[PDB]
Amino acid sequence: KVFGRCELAAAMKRHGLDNYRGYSLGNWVCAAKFESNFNTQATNRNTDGSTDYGILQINSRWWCNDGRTPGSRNLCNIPCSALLSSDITASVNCAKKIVSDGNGMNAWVAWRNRCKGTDVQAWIRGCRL
Ligand SMILES: [Au+]
């Protein structure tokens, strides 16, 4: 699924990401935009042979099993393909465990380079939330 901006903001809010570990809803929306373009099906290989999955580009190096990332962890206890669903539950719950692990949203390279220290409020402008 490719979400609309406000449609994704509403789903993320419903799922509790809103000010989760202090990150306002617009940070999450901005991260999704720059990670996946709001597309739940997005996949992208990393240089180390891991892959990033879904709307939040969750890495198989640590968080999920894709059957082709040797000596990696699966800390969300899920197949990475779960992260590609039209339903974002698995992605959001996994993201909660990622952001909570001590480095915050900096785990998301697109967030750190494109969203951090910007007016992320603009990502939820106009949305009925
Ligand atoms: Au403001």
Swiss-Prot record:
Entry keyword set: Allergen, Antimicrobial, Bacteriolytic enzyme, Disulfide bond, Glycosidase, Hydrolase, Secreted, Signal
Q: What is this protein called?
A: Lysozyme C
Disulfide bond listed as a keyword: yes
Question: What lineage, starting at the top, does this entry show?
Answer: Eukaryota, Metazoa, Chordata, Craniata, Vertebrata
Q: What else is known?
A: Lysozyme C is capable of both hydrolysis and transglycosylation; it also shows a slight esterase activity. It acts rapidly on both peptide-substituted and unsubstituted peptidoglycan, and slowly on chitin oligosaccharides.
Positions binding substrate in this chain are: D101
* SMART domains documented for this protein: LYZ1
Name the Enzyme Commission number(s) assigned to this protein: 3.2.1.17
Domain C-type lysozyme, by residue range, is 1-129
Q: Which residues form the active site?
A: E35, D52
Q: Which GO terms describe its molecular function?
A: beta-N-acetylglucosaminidase activity; identical protein binding; lysozyme activity
Species this chain originates from:
Gallus gallus
Q: Give any single GO term for biological process.
A: defense response to Gram-positive bacterium
Q: What are the cysteine partners in each disulfide bond?
A: C6-C127, C30-C115, C64-C80, C76-C94
First-listed, main subcellular location of the protein, grouped into a coarse class = secreted
Relate the assembly described in the record.
Answer: Monomer.
